[PDB]
Amino acid sequence: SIEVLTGLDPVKKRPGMYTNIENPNHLIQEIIDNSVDEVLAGFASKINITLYEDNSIEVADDGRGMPVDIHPEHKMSGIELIMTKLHSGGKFSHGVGVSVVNALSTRLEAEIKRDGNVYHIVFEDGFKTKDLEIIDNVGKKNTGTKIRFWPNKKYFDDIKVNFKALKNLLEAKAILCKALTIKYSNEIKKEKLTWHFETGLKGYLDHKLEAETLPAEPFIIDNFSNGDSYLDAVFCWCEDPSESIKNSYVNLIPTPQDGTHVTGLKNGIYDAIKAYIEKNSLSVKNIKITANDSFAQLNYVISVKITNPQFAGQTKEKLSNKDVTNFVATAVKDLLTIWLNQNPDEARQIVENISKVAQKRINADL
Ligand SMILES: CCc1[nH]c2nc(Sc3cccnc3)nc(OC)c2c1C=O
């Protein structure tokens, strides 16, 4: 509806607006986000990161490979177009685009494999400096995008990549993609890692809580969907040592301010505690349970993968997609019920505990 294309001068002259200027970690994030799009779209399964001793970063993936076709209107390869311009848009007047990286880099290189050609192009301070050419050939099914870049010292407090932060980030990302394998190679500290979580979130709560949780084997929703689309979640009840694990994600973007997906998980848990209480007549007469009680001592991680993530206001901190709320709800209800119906011992230990919670709340009302 409103598409906006500009040059890179805005970014160059307000870096703090388009990246965190402490170090290049964010620049790397932006490129991982792009690989991650291909992983979410189902075309990619690898993201490989090398940190070189010259302080450049290289991020590679086995995705479809950045487009190379000449834009009928802009007269320029897809890849050049994305690289040498800010793209933005909306309905009326991060996800800032890789051209931010290009801009704040002294040198950036891209190597693409599509259609059995290997393409190459170099840029400097965000301007093309060597034409897109075919430098090799490759099997038709050998595809991907590979970018290496030399952040430009003048923009950053420090050019040194904060290593620990990146590794944490990469671990966080793999956990949320059982289909993804992330290799990482720091040539400066001579160290390599590989993350592959075939298992998924399974174990994470066990590990991060290491207290007695209920259920003892926290509840897994493994890759539930319908094409509306994808729910992974893990949850259990526990108690304090301030061990708040309450994490939520859309398309791997942290939602520190919750929304439709979180709401959805709150409802469906309630929904199926109500339904289970009634089914077995586990009521007590002046203890009407509420949605908040079933949630009070809940520890969880919910990660949602959806086609059109609409957010709240200016930043991508809260998910506002009306209708994930009932997509997350229906699943958690049915899914949890089945477990409840099969788990007398723990299902009733859970209800009794939520009753204590509601009971204690009702008391505090004078
Ligand atoms: C390694 C990082 C990366 N990996 C990428 N893979 C694709 S594949 C694709 C994307 C959109 C349309 N057609 C193909 N496209 C991209 O740019 C749009 C990137 C990309 C951009 O930085």
Side-chain angles (χ1 to χ4, degrees), residues 31 34-35 38 59-61 64-67 82 98 114 145 147:
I31 288 160
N34 280 260
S35 296
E38 283 292 284
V59 167
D61 69 56
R64 282 167 295 170
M66 291 195 68
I82 287 142
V98 80
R114 275 182 81 87
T145 293
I147 296 151

Side-chain angles (χ1 to χ4, degrees), residues 150-169:
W150 289 257
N152 175 339
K153 80 173 80 92
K154 70 145 138 204
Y155 303 108
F156 299 88
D157 288 336
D158 186 18
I159 36 89
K160 204 203 76 81
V161 170
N162 177 1
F163 309 140
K164 214 266 170 308
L166 175 57
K167 294 146 87 161
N168 292 340
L169 187 103

Side-chain angles (χ1 to χ4, degrees), residues 28 30-39 41 43-44 46-48 58-68 78-79 82-83 97-99 101 108 111-112 114 144-148:
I28 313 177
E30 164 63 34
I31 288 160
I32 293 159
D33 287 359
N34 280 260
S35 296
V36 157
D37 281 1
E38 283 292 284
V39 176
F43 305 96
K46 295 142 158 312
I47 295 165
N48 298 339
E58 186 176 37
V59 167
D61 69 56
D62 66 345
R64 282 167 295 170
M66 291 195 68
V68 295
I79 190 196
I82 287 142
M83 284 288 193
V98 80
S99 78
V101 182
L108 178 151
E111 186 188 289
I112 281 76
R114 275 182 81 87
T145 293
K146 165 142 97 211
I147 296 151
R148 186 186 171 166

Side-chain angles (χ1 to χ4, degrees), residues 328-348:
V328 176
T330 310
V332 179
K333 185 213 184 168
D334 307 323
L335 259 323
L336 187 45
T337 294
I338 280 150
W339 189 83
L340 255 9
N341 291 159
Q342 265 147 251
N343 290 259
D345 278 51
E346 278 179 318
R348 302 179 207 257

